[PDB]
Amino acid sequence: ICVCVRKRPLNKQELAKKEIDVISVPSKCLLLVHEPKLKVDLTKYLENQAFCFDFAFDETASNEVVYRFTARPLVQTIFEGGKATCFAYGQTGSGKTHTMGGDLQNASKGIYAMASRDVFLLKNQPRYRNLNLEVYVTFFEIYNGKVFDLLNKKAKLRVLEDSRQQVQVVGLQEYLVTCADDVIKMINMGSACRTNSSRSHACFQILLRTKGRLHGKFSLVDLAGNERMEGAEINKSLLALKECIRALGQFRESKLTQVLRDSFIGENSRTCMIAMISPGISSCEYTLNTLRYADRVKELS
Amino acid sequence: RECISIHVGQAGVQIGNACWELYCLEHGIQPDGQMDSFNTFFSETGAGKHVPRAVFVDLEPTVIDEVRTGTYRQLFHPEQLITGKEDAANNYARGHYTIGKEIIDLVLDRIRKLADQCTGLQGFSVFHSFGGGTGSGFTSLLMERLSVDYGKKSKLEFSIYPAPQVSTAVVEPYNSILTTHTTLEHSDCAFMVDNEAIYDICRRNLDIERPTYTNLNRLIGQIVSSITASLRFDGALNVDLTEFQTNLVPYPRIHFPLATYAPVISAEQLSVAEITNACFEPANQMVKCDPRHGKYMACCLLYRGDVVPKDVNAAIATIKTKRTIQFVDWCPTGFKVGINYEPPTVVPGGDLAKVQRAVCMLSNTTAIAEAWARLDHKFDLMYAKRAFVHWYVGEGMEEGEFSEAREDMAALEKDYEEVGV
Amino acid sequence: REIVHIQAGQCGNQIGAKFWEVISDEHGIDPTGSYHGDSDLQLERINVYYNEAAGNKYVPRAILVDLEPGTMDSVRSGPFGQIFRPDNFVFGQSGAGNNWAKGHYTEGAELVDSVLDVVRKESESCDCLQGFQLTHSLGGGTGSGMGTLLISKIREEYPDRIMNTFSVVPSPKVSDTVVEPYNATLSVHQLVENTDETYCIDNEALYDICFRTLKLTTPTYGDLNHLVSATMSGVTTCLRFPGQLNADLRKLAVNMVPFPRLHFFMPGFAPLTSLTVPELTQQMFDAKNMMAACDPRHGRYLTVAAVFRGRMSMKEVDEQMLNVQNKNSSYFVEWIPNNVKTAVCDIPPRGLKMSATFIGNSTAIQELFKRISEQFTAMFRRKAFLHWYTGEGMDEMEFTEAESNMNDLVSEYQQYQDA
Ligand SMILES: Nc1nc2c(ncn2[C@@H]2O[C@H](COP(=O)(O)OP(=O)(O)OP(=O)(O)O)[C@@H](O)[C@H]2O)c(=O)[nH]1
Ligand SMILES: Nc1ncnc2c1ncn2[C@@H]1O[C@H](COP(=O)(O)OP(=O)(O)NP(=O)(O)O)[C@@H](O)[C@H]1O
Ligand SMILES: COc1cc2c(c(OC)c1OC)-c1ccc(OC)c(=O)cc1[C@@H](NC(=O)CS)CC2
Ligand SMILES: Nc1nc2c(ncn2[C@@H]2O[C@H](COP(=O)(O)OP(=O)(O)O)[C@@H](O)[C@H]2O)c(=O)[nH]1
Ligand SMILES: [Mg+2]
Ligand SMILES: [Mg+2]
Numbered sequence A: 001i002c003v004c005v006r007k008r009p010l011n012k013q014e015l016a017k018k019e020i021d022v023i024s025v026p027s028k029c030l031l032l033v034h035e036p037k038l039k040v041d042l043t044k045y046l047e048n049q050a051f052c053f054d055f056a057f058d059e060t061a062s063n064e065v066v067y068r069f070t071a072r073p074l075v076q077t078i079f080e081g082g083k084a085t086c087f088a089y090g091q092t093g094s095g096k097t098h099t100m101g102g103d104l105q106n107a108s109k110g111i112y113a114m115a116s117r118d119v120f121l122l123k124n125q126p127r128y129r130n131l132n133l134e135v136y137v138t139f140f141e142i143y144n145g146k147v148f149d150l151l152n153k154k155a156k157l158r159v160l161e162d163s164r165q166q167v168q169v170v171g172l173q174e175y176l177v178t179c180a181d182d183v184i185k186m187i188n189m190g191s192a193c194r195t196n197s198s199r200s201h202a203c204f205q206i207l208l209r210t211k212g213r214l215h216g217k218f219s220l221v222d223l224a225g226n227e228r229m230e231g232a233e234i235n236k237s238l239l240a241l242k243e244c245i246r247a248l249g250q251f252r253e254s255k256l257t258q259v260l261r262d263s264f265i266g267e268n269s270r271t272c273m274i275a276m277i278s279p280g281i282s283s284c285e286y287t288l289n290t291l292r293y294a295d296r297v298k299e300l301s
Numbered sequence B: 001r002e003c004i005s006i007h008v009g010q011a012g013v014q015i016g017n018a019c020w021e022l023y024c025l026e027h028g029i030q031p032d033g034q035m036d037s038f039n040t041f042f043s044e045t046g047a048g049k050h051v052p053r054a055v056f057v058d059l060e061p062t063v064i065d066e067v068r069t070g071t072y073r074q075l076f077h078p079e080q081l082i083t084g085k086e087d088a089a090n091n092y093a094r095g096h097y098t099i100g101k102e103i104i105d106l107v108l109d110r111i112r113k114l115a116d117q118c119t120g121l122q123g124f125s126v127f128h129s130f131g132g133g134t135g136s137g138f139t140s141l142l143m144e145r146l147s148v149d150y151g152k153k154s155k156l157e158f159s160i161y162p163a164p165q166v167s168t169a170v171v172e173p174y175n176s177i178l179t180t181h182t183t184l185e186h187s188d189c190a191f192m193v194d195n196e197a198i199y200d201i202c203r204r205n206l207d208i209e210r211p212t213y214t215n216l217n218r219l220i221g222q223i224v225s226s227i228t229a230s231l232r233f234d235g236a237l238n239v240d241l242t243e244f245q246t247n248l249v250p251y252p253r254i255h256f257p258l259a260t261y262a263p264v265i266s267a268e269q270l271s272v273a274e275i276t277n278a279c280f281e282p283a284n285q286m287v288k289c290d291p292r293h294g295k296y297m298a299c300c301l302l303y304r305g306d307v308v309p310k311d312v313n314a315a316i317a318t319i320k321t322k323r324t325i326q327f328v329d330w331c332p333t334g335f336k337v338g339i340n341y342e343p344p345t346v347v348p349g350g351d352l353a354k355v356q357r358a359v360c361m362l363s364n365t366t367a368i369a370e371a372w373a374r375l376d377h378k379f380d381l382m383y384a385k386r387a388f389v390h391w392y393v394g395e396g397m398e399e400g401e402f403s404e405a406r407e408d409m410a411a412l413e414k415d416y417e418e419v420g421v
Numbered sequence C: 001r002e003i004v005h006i007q008a009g010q011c012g013n014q015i016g017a018k019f020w021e022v023i024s025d026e027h028g029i030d031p032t033g034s035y036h037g038d039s040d041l042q043l044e045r046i047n048v049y050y051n052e053a054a055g056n057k058y059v060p061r062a063i064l065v066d067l068e069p070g071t072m073d074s075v076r077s078g079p080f081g082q083i084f085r086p087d088n089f090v091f092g093q094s095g096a097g098n099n100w101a102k103g104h105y106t107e108g109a110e111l112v113d114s115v116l117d118v119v120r121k122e123s124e125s126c127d128c129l130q131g132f133q134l135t136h137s138l139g140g141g142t143g144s145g146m147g148t149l150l151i152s153k154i155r156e157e158y159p160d161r162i163m164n165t166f167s168v169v170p171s172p173k174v175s176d177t178v179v180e181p182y183n184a185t186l187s188v189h190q191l192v193e194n195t196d197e198t199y200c201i202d203n204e205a206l207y208d209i210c211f212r213t214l215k216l217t218t219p220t221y222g223d224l225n226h227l228v229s230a231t232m233s234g235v236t237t238c239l240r241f242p243g244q245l246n247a248d249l250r251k252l253a254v255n256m257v258p259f260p261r262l263h264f265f266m267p268g269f270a271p272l273t274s275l276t277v278p279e280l281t282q283q284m285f286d287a288k289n290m291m292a293a294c295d296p297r298h299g300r301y302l303t304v305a306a307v308f309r310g311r312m313s314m315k316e317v318d319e320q321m322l323n324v325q326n327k328n329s330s331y332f333v334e335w336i337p338n339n340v341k342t343a344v345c346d347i348p349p350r351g352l353k354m355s356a357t358f359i360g361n362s363t364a365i366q367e368l369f370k371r372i373s374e375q376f377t378a379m380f381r382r383k384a385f386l387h388w389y390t391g392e393g394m395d396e397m398e399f400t401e402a403e404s405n406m407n408d409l410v411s412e413y414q415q416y417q418d419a
Helices: A012-016 A061-066 A072-078 A096-101 A109-125 A179-192 A229-247 A257-258 A281-298 B007-026 B063-067 B094-114 B132-149 B173-187 B196-206 B213-230 B271-275 B311-323 B367-383 B390-395 B397-418 C010-027 C070-076 C102-103 C106-125 C147-154 C182-195 C203-211 C222-241 C253-257 C278-284 C315-327 C361-376 C399-415
Strands: A004-008 A030-038 A044-052 A054-055 A083-090 A132-144 A146-149 A153-163 A167-170 A175-176 A203-211 A214-222 A269-277 B006-010 B056-058 B081-083 B123-129 B154-161 B189-194 B302-305 B336-342 C003-008 C062-065 C129-138 C160-171 C197-202 C264-269 C300-308 C340-345 C357-363
Touching: A004 A281, A012 C361, A030 A281, A044 A281, A044 B132, A061 A096, A061 A109, A061 B007, A072 A083, A072 A109, A072 A203, A072 A214, A072 A269, A083 A096, A096 A109, A096 A203, A096 A214, A096 A269, A109 A132, A109 A179, A109 A203, A109 A214, A132 A179, A132 A257, A132 C197, A146 A257, A153 A257, A153 C278, A153 C399, A167 A257, A175 A179, A179 A203, A179 C160, A203 A257, A214 B173, A229 A257, A229 A269, A229 A281, A229 B390, A281 B397, B006 B007, B006 B094, B006 B132, B007 B056, B007 B123, B007 B132, B007 B154, B007 B213, B056 B063, B056 B094, B056 B132, B063 B081, B063 C160, B081 B094, B094 B132, B094 B173, B094 B390, B123 B132, B132 B154, B132 B173, B154 B173, B173 B367, B189 B196, B189 B367, B213 B302, B213 B311, B271 B311, B302 B311, B311 B336, B311 C203, B367 B397, C003 C010, C003 C106, C003 C147, C010 C062, C010 C070, C010 C129, C010 C222, C062 C106, C102 C106, C102 C182, C106 C147, C129 C147, C147 C160, C147 C182, C160 C182, C160 C203, C160 C222, C182 C399, C197 C203, C197 C222, C197 C253, C197 C361, C203 C222, C222 C264, C222 C300, C222 C340, C222 C357, C253 C300, C264 C361, C278 C315, C278 C357, C315 C340, C357 C361, C361 C399
Parallel strands: A004 A054, A004 A269, A083 A214, A083 A269, B006 B056, B006 B123, B056 B081, B123 B154, B154 B189, B302 B336, C003 C062, C003 C129, C129 C160, C160 C197, C197 C264, C300 C340
Antiparallel strands: A030 A044, A132 A146, A132 A175, A132 A203, A146 A153, A153 A167, A203 A214, C264 C357, C300 C357
């Protein structure tokens, strides 16, 4: 388990509204929140809080830099026959989709793409050549306990779970890719018909297969905002996610954790959590909420 | 000039039901109808009747229905009694959003129907429960909107802080924290009443093994009477709201003054010096805690009955000689003393007797924050596991609003402690 | 504010029939006629359980469902047979089942609409509908399979209001079918998803109470129903009677169920068979007196709700009620504050001068789910009698999908014996 935080810069709208930037990342593992506060007598002061992560990225960090220290180290895990998961977590507008899917739009500039790029590079390496693996991709979203295939026109799928308890998503479409350009075509397609704005869970998968068997799988997840009572399903999934990840380094189930169940139960499984933060003073309470959730996640490492 | 009373939800309703009855007895208004000064609270309607300037709202009939039943039935207008069929369910999220929305427009409009026959209104006195369905939810929403329709006009809340024994609900602490957050930037001054403190006073004093609501309310009635009184009689103590609060709250952070009632003694004369002496006694407070610990940043003495200042003075002198004065650094030594010659009338079949003279003492101490802690702990500890949160997310609330609210209570508890020397 | 009562499948029908005639005499109601009894209270909230028709008459807001006539005509020519509204009965005629599938798909679906369309009449007649409560068995099928269906179809037409059930979970002793575990598991899954509160009346527990502590040799379905029937009156008292609480039944839910997964209550009664107070509590908190085969010891209580009955001083009750969660203060989860609430009402039940009943959301209930999942995976292992369902249209993996959901429920309850 690896936990990171990424601060996005203030955008045009926020700068125009003269939003104050209350986030500092003085080192590669330290993030500071300059929380505005008032004493009882109305005196203004700062309660500067400190959080430490495996990696803390500032507003000047590009997606490639973020990718290098988060999902990149997990690709090898699937070639070694494991199951990896990378989650983008945070408030609405914090940068989750921008990081995983591309800037906004541009698939190539996102983690899904970059990860794919390294998967093709590794499979062609001598240590793996003799694996004779085939690369497959899937893209689906979870909305109100329902699974929808984004590569099969939002087709609603069924999720079943025997007694042995493994889960299976009936009908999910797996597409064969042999080139990064292939993957970029499936990402554009999927993102084009996704339910920008959260409301769902996005999950783009990269599977490795050899002979009827699954060699390894990497599930990249673009979570829904963490901050119409569907927020109950979102909060239950996030609560469920936390306990599943913590159970990895040692419920009250939800769809998300049910579908990704097999990626937390194995002994050869790794995960990375990236906490996105919007730097504005107006989002300070949302930030603290994101950071404290993150603390408890890494708390199991 | 004028003055609207609003009672929302069971506790709110029943409390007011009992202090609108002490009001009548004080001003001698035979339930039926008739008998300025008395005008601060009543509107001389028809060529007989006297009727209150109040509005009662609950999200189920039940409570209000008993009002349109027992005598006093005639006392109000049918309109000032709003009722709502579907219950609040016991969760702010319902009262503030789901079930409230539906009745807010009808209440909001009627209270404005009341304020319309008031040449220069003053503000609203609002009575509601802390935890409790619509007491927390609807109240919060009312206040938000009252602030929109009535800019200046002050808002004085009379809140009921919940206590384990006079039965609460498991989720109570959530509700309390929740309302007190939204509601805080919109009230001017609020009077908290600990149900444990009143249950307590009814035991040590009235000597009731099983204190009823109807038993508690009667006592609360009295505390409230003594609080308003000043601005009902009229030329006496705390005249025209404003100068009431300008006296207790030094900081915008809505400060909740601590109330202490004088001599409570069962039916079936106490010295002026003695009742004052009983005012600086923890066992007689309105919110269980103790100021021999914290500090005072504004003291108030509100007497009623036969009293000359000559004594009130010598009682204060000796009340400081062998006592825990403990006044705070940057603030005089208050003691805005107010005497209201009009004697303390009590309910006829009541449990308390007529008394020659009674005191009130409203103090804004830092030790009142000891109650903001007792609540946070309960909340914090349940929230540690999303204990019941899902019922709120269910009506359409954000898990964030739970953080964002406790987040303020963390802050308030800081401010309170920060005022110390 | 007002509740309708669905009652389906041989067990359910019999169980509820005793419930009805038991509360009816509590309120003082004749086989048809109205009031008769020097009491006055009764009538306040008689509203809640009785839609009242022509002239005096009281007629309960009850819907009767089954997939074979017999059981229904057992009621009609029985206790308070004349009391229920005639076209409120919904006959089945065709094969019963005693196989879930039949009741939740084939012979079930067949009826559903004709019942749903009668609950729809009762509901829309209600001045302000509170929710539904249904009685049925989890084993067998004409109510464990149609029932779980009926409810799957009530939510959808009524997401709004809440779903309440009294479900008899079956055992290896005192059972008519080898398949019960299949029928049971198949429903448990359904209940978890579409109900707000479910009371577990374990028949294993039930039998134990009659013979293990009541000298009653051959336990009829009779003196056994007498237990459930008395328990059910105890559990509803506060919503049908005074002016202490009022009981939104939603308030009851919001307050008893901390976690979404509808948590199942194990009930318990005070005196029994067909009382000092300290003597009454000591008993109402005893395993030997729970309505479900469990033992709160092997597990903590999430929240507890107790309701006394009869002329007695609360001064003593509040005192004893504190004295239980003290001599046993380790068994009450400490992460939920005042998690044990007690209500007292002063109108004595049948016989009994004093009485108490108990509702408990306890992680020990885990024990019960585990033991039915024990005979399930113990049969579905080498696919047992399974071909009886395969045949009615079901899929093989709809069994694993149920089993899997169910074990989680165990793996969750066992997760909350935390700190
Ligand atoms: N002092 C006092 N407290 C009361 C009274 N009635 C209820 N309470 C308290 O109020 C809190 C519960 O508030 P409720 O009035 O029942 O809640 P509500 O939503 O406003 O009313 P309902 O719609 O009936 O649920 C608890 O703290 C109770 O102890 C009363 O008459 N006097
Ligand atoms: N590091 C970054 N640099 C520049 N722009 C960014 C960055 N991160 C996010 N943005 C922009 O800010 C917005 C937030 O994007 P995304 O669309 O990334 O949010 P979420 O996905 O954070 N939001 P939501 O779907 O509401 O939960 C978009 O308009 C992005 O283009
Ligand atoms: C069906 O009628 C019932 C309805 C309710 C309650 C209950 O249990 C005592 C019932 O009896 C079974 C109830 C329950 C639970 C609580 O927490 C465990 C609570 O605090 C409170 C309660 C009951 N309310 C009170 O005790 C208010 S002072 C109201 C909801
Ligand atoms: N206590 C109670 N349980 C019963 C009764 N009848 C049956 N049961 C239990 O419930 C299970 C199924 O009940 P049954 O009515 O035959 O199923 P149906 O076809 O759905 O009506 C059986 O396995 C028994 O354990 C009853 O009369 N009272
Ligand atoms: Mg997004
Ligand atoms: Mg309420």
